[PDB]
Amino acid sequence: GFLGAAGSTMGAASMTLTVQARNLLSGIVQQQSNLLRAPECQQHLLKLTVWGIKQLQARVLAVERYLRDQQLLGIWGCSGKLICCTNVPWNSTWSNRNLSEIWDNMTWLQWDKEISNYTQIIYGLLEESQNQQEKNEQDLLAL
């Protein structure tokens, strides 16, 4: 189920990526499957303005988070992919543990706390790698 492999190690936990990945902004399909609530529910929200503004802010925040995640995936050259290798070598500064020690004997939460300091540098390097790859693709198309 959702977050079922939260406590499992990273190696085993990587098999449930699709379920958790899809559930992200599941509301975009669920609220429509809920028919945007019953017709009287829309009237209740519209009549009392503070509730309407509150739930509207919640929906807009959810949409913005989803778009930010998809933009981050797109700008790294991994749009529509759940797993993707990338042309960025791993630095020893970020983590110098053996591969078995990372993909086994450690959960995703522990790893996330472990490399919480270097995430922005990783994202910057991924963006640079994608941009250089795109420039090289343009050059090769010219060639």
Partner 1 sequence: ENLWVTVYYGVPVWKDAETTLFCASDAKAYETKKHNVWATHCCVPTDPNPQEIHLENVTEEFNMWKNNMVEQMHTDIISLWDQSLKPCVKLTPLCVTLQCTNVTNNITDDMRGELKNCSFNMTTELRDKKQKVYSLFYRLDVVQINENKEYRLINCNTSAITQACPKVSFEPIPIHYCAPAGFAILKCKDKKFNGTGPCTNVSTVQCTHGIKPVVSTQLLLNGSLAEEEVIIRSENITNNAKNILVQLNESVQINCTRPNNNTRKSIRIGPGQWFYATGDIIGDIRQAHCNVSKATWNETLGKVVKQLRKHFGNNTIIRFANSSGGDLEVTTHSFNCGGEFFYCNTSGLFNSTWISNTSNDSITLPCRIKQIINMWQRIGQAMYAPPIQGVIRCVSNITGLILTRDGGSTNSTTETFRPGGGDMRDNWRSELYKYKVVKIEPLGVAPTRCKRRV
Ligand X SMILES: *[C@@H]1O[C@H](CO)[C@@H](O[C@@H]2O[C@H](CO)[C@@H](O)[C@H](O)[C@H]2NC(C)=O)[C@H](O)[C@H]1NC(C)=O
Ligand Y SMILES: *[C@@H]1O[C@H](CO)[C@@H](O)[C@H](O)[C@H]1NC(C)=O
x-or-dash string of contact with ligand Y, 99-118, rule CB under 6 A: ---------------x-xx-
Rounded to whole angstroms, the Cα distance separating 124 from 26 reads 28
Instruction: Give how far the C-alpha of residue 33 lies from the chain's centroid of Cα atoms, to the nearest Å.
Output: 23
Helical H segments across 96-142, by residue range: 99-103, 108-114, 119-142
x-or-dash string of contact with ligand Y, 3-22, rule CB under 6 A: ----xx--------------
Tokens matching residue 50: 């503070």
Q: 79 is in the binding site of which of ligand Y, partner 1, ligand X, none (Cβ under 5 to 8 A by kind)?
A: none
The CB-nearest residue to ligand X is: 8
Cβ(111)–Cβ(7) below 8 Å: no
Tokens matching residue 28: 């975009």
Rounded to whole angstroms, the Cα distance separating 61 from 106 reads 32
Residues that bind ligand Y (CB under 6 A): 7-8, 114, 116-117
- Per CB under 8 A, residues contacting a second copy are 14-18, 21-22, 24-26, 28-29, 31-32, 36, 46, 48-50, 52-54, 56-57, 59-61, 63-68, 71-72, 74-75, 77, 79-85, 127-128, 130-131, 134-135, 137-138, 141-142
